Amino acid sequence: VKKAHSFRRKTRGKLSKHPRRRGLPPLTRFLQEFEVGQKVHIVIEPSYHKGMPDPRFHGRTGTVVGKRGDAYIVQITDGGKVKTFFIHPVHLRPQK
Amino acid sequence: AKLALIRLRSGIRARGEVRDTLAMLRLHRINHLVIVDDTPSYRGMIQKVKDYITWGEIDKETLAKLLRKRGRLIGNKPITDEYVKEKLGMTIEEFAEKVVNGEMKLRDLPNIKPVFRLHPPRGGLKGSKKRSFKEGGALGYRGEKINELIERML
Amino acid sequence: LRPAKIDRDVDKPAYTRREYIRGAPGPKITIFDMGNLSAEFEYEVSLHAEQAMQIRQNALEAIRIQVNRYLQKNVGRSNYHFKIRVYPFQVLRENPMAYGNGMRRPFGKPIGLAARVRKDQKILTVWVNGQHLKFALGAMHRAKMKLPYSAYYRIYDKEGNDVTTKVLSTM
């Protein structure tokens, strides 16, 4: 039986947490700041459902190109295409 | 230290990874030799192509014989003491001593071709192409014994 | 029933979970400990599998009955603590085909149960004293006969160290 892709298909592990986190993250993540051109890792936090990208791109590294609202604009290169996302800083982590 | 690599097996029935790594090492054909430096970035590639080549540490006398017999310039011209004494203040023996002890690179000799094209070994390979030198075959790492083989193939 | 060479090997995924398997059968084996259970014997004679194996509960029960009858007729309930260590958790299935539809929708219905064992694994044990090692070896042989693959027996002391050669030499 062929099954279409959806937001939460095969996410049992990818969007779980070690039972010792089990709650709100420390607040230095919600209050991050990045600059245009900075490289960021995409690391989804499963307790915040706002500003969350397709989990297919969990584990990738992109670059910041701008800002809209409280969300940052992140560009990735999927194969030979550029894709643009508006992601909340709680799902991001800087490279070095 | 400088390592010598000789290609032994064909690329048919082999992975594109191996084929491309050999192309990057400039080992396009069988019974062809290349000299490189013992750096980690090269050792990784050698480990990737371990099953299609032999390799080992080379000596200065062997390198001098190699340059005198199988060395070529652009145009497939032989190398001569005339040319070496002109372009550098040395003979082939001194150039080889340096090259293997640092202080000098082969490509410092202008218009030197970076690939040596050998005939197959005299008396034959004394071990299978399907096995490694350690367990009685022909493939993989030798030590100083790559010079015996270069002599047989020179 | 169907020959055991069909179920001997272990090349299929494990199929041991009953909250998802519809119509799974109950076991035909209920007794795994026989004899005297609180008697602190000297020698431990244990069977061991020679390669990975899949034993049917039918074979297990036959082994049990035969070996226990032998040990009772020869040694006496007061001795010979006899144990089977492995439980049948695998579920075996057969395709309901043989009008029929052949290989259309082939996924077997459950028929039976089996225990999985890996190489050099203990299957059963007899705890006995010196004067009955002959009968313990006899039981080893009788059980060996009724198995799909081959097995080897070893002997152990208190502290569980191998004394098999020393005990085999001196009879």
């Binding site: 010792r20 709650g23 709100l24 | - | -």
Partner: protein, 164 residues
Amino acid sequence: AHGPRYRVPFRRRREGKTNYHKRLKLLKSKKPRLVVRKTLNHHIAQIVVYDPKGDKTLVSAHTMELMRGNTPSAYLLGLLIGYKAKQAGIEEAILDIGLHPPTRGSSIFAVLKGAVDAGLNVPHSEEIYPEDYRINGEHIANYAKAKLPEHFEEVKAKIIEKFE
């Protein structure tokens, strides 16, 4: 703490001193914070700015600094803090209340009113302020007949002369 699956809460939450949800909502703004805590016998207030290694305090005020725990003392605390802040070079702020419930007519909001009157811009709607007959003392005085307003106004004029 009973095994590998037991989540141990934050230290301040174990202690019973910080609400992190409200902390987040307050930090979402980049204006600074006006903290006001209250004890059985005293008040304390200060002005705080955020840093990821630890909050930094710029100003403070204590009812000891005054008498050198009720609505008049809180109003005078607000007077002091509002007069002190306008020096340091900050004219903006938002209130923080912690684990104190908001009740119409409490000394916390008395502090808010005092600081406002001192002239520090703090957004608010005048429906929670306590009555001025409570700020005065009429409450305690008229209790005493079954810190007179005199000395209240004395301290008032003192503080206003000092920070005119």
